[PDB]
């Protein structure tokens, strides 16, 4: 509805992520693996699940690709601004958001088919006793798909990454005010102001996702301990699989987006520093 994330990881490469759709498809991705991993007889089914999820991605991409003309128009506008059409950028950005909301039910149909797939697997979940259900599927899944991600994030220190990004925005904010106060008679002063304004907003979205990753890492790590060397009653076993698939989905969404936004923040700072190399060269050649 209003939970879209714009991402420019490379030069002239814009894309979007409908936050709720990402979490939803990811939740059912985890439900699927958890159901097939529970018993060894069904592990091999992951081949089919991987194939189906590829069909879901290819189908969803076909819907996103309808809004490609509007997206490529906004890419062309942003390209010109990275050299006054700031008002034209806002109207082309609103235009992209509009056709995304237009294809709302085309995306919903894909999401719903994904819910059905994972739910069918979830519904066929044997338990030899039903009063003692093996938590094997929970660990085999956790260990392969989720555990590794917990450790990469634990090592990263995402708060220092955020602190280093504020310093970048503060340096640019000071250079921007020193140019305005001292020598405002410069070319590309508006493009610096635009890039810094865009990078300030990217930072806030990274700041949001890192907050989620931080507590979700603690939650997942605490929860998994309790659903791992036990034997739940089928009803309770299924409840945990859903609960875990939920925690995994919120974590993977915010983690995936934070990394994508991180690349766009530093891609925009690369183009920003290209202009700073011009500004130092100009000031140096003038100083001759």
């Amino acid at each position: 509805a209003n939970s879209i994330d714009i991402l420019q990881e490379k030069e002239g490469h814009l894309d979007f992520v409908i936050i709720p759709h990402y979490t939803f498809l990811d939740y059912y991705k985890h439900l699927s693996y958890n159901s097939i991993y529970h018993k060894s007889s069904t592990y091999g089914k992951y081949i089919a699940v991987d194939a189906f999820i590829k069909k879901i991605n290819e189908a969803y991409d076909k819907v996103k690709s309808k809004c490609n003309d509007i997206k490529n128009d906004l890419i062309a506008t942003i390209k010109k601004l990275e050299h006054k059409m700031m008002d034209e950028y806002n109207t082309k950005k609103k235009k992209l958001i509009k056709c995304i909301k237009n294809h709302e039910n085309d995306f919903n149909k894909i999401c719903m088919d994904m819910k059905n797939y994972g739910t069918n697997l979830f519904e066929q979940l044997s338990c030899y006793n039903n009063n003692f259900c093996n938590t094997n599927g929970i660990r085999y899944h956790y260990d392969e798909y989720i555990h590794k991600l917990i450790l990469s994030v634990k090592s990263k220190n995402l708060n220092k990454d955020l602190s280093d990004m504020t310093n970048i925005l503060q340096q640019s904010e000071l250079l921007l005010t020193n140019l305005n106060k001292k020598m405002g008679s410069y070319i590309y002063i508006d493009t610096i102001k635009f890039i810094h304004k865009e990078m300030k907003h990217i930072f806030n979205r990274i700041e949001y996702h890192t907050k989620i990753i931080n507590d979700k890492t603690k939650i997942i790590q605490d929860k998994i301990k309790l659903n791992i060397w036990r034997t739940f009653q089928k009803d309770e076993l299924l409840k945990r699989i859903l609960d875990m698939s939920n925690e995994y989905s919120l974590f993977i969404t915010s983690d995936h987006l934070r990394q994508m936004l991180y690349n766009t923040f530093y891609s925009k700072e690369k183009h920003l520093n290209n202009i700073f190399h011009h500004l130092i060269y100009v000031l140096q050649m003038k100083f001759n």
Partner: single-chain antibody, 223 residues
Framework: QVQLQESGPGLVKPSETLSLTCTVS????????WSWIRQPPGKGLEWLGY???????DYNPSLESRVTISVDTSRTRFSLRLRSVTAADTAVYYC?????????????WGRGTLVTVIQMTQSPSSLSASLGDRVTITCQAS??????LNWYQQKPGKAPKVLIY???NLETGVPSRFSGSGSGTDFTFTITSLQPEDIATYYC?????????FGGGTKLEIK
């Protein structure tokens, strides 16, 4: 296990509305695809339409808008209403279920009740081979289908049952002697070695373009 059971009039006077209901037992309806497929005596299969997701519907234009599929989810039943019947509508009505449209195939089929009032060209309509022989059937679509092709085995008297989905992939229990192959327009089903448990009529199906169509079938018998 999930089970579908159709219950209807079995005899409808011409131009009246045919009303059969299906009762989903041992499972919920929820957002699955609940279709009604009919089979005229001695003829092939026709998908009439389905109800899916939050009560959305899609019907076969051949039905001429006189078809309506509805669901009282609370009842856990879905039902068919076919207005202005003709002796054309004399058929065995199967109530069936697919899970998606992304990778559509029929998971469960009811017992089928007799009610008496893209071009999938399946190549060997009949075939009589000895046991052990390799039998190989062909299905050709009127246009591009990608690998959106399924194959069913309809045992004598029984409802059709999925053997291959997405042109080549076998369903979990189906024996390896069955082989799906093909993409785009030309598809081929092949039993590498004929078994006594194989005397059935096999049908192909497409799901690429919305009016879901079946093939002519191959009535396989022993010589």
């Amino acid at each position: 296990q999930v089970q579908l059971q159709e219950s209807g009039p079995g005899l409808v006077k011409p131009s009246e509305t045919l009303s059969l209901t299906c009762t989903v037992s041992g499972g919920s309806i929820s957002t699955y695809y609940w279709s009604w497929i009919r089979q005229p005596p001695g003829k092939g299969l026709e998908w009439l339409g389905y109800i899916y997701h939050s009560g959305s519907t899609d019907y076969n234009p051949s039905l001429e808008s006189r078809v309506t599929i509805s669901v009282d989810t609370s009842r856990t039943r879905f039902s068919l209403r076919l207005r202005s019947v003709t002796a054309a509508d004399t058929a065995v009505y199967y109530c069936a279920r697919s899970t998606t449209m992304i990778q559509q195939y029929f998971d469960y089929w009811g017992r089928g009740t007799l009610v008496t009032v893209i071009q999938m060209t399946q190549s060997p309509s009949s075939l009589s081979a000895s046991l052990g022989d390799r039998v190989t059937i062909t299905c050709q679509a009127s246009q591009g289908i990608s690998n959106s092709l399924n194959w069913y085995q309809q045992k004598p008297g029984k409802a059709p049952k999925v053997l291959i989905y997405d042109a080549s992939n076998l369903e979990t229990g189906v024996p390896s002697r069955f082989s799906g192959s093909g993409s785009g327009t030309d598809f081929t089903f092949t039993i590498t070695s004929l078994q006594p448990e194989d005397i059935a009529t096999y049908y192909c199906q497409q799901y690429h373009y919305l009016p879901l169509t079946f093939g002519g079938g191959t009535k396989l018998e022993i010589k």
